[PDB]
């Protein structure tokens, strides 16, 4: 029941996550559109910001729009890469 919208920086971020991710995220996002305000996912101190497991979105009631603002990863890309190397 909520419209989707992406911040342009986040859409650019989205186009670099890879094939596998931006699909499982697309799934969880469209699910969020039904009822965006999930208490278990609300960022601390932030009245309108929520997380998807990361992805962050802003709920804009005045427009009924879910605004995806930030999407990325827990660590730097180098940390996962170095972790893969470290175990070889």
Residue numbers in the entry: 2 to 54, 61 to 95
Can I see the authors' text?
The bacterial relBE locus encodes a toxin-antitoxin complex in which the toxin, RelE, is capable of cleaving mRNA in the ribosomal A site cotranslationally. The antitoxin, RelB, both binds and inhibits RelE, and regulates transcription through operator binding and conditional cooperativity controlled by RelE. Binding of RelB inhibits RelE by displacement of the C-terminal, flexible α-helix, which contains a tyrosine residue (Tyr87) that is critical for catalysis (Li et al., 2009). RelB is additionally known to dimerize through formation of a ribbon-helix-helix (RHH) DNA binding motif that allows transcriptional autoregulation through binding to the relO operator region (Li et al., 2008; Overgaard et al., 2009).
Two additional crystal structures of isolated RelE further show that the C-terminal helix uses this motif to adopt multiple, defined conformations. To better assess the structural rearrangements that take place in RelE upon RelB binding, we determined the structures of isolated RelE present in the two crystal forms obtained for the isolated toxin (P21 and P212121). In the structure of the P212121 crystal form, which has two molecules in the ASU, RelE also forms a domain-swap dimer involving the C-terminal helix; however, this interaction is not symmetrical. The interaction patterns observed between helix α3 and the core domain are identical in the RelE monomer, symmetrical dimer, and one molecule of the asymmetrical dimer, whereas they differ in the other molecule. The most common interaction is characterized by a strong salt bridge between Arg93 and Glu14 in addition to multiple contacts between hydrophobic residues such as Val86 and Tyr87 (left). In the alternative conformation observed in the asymmetrical dimer, the helix is pulled farther back and Arg93 now makes a hydrophobic interaction by stacking its guanidinium group on Phe74 (middle).
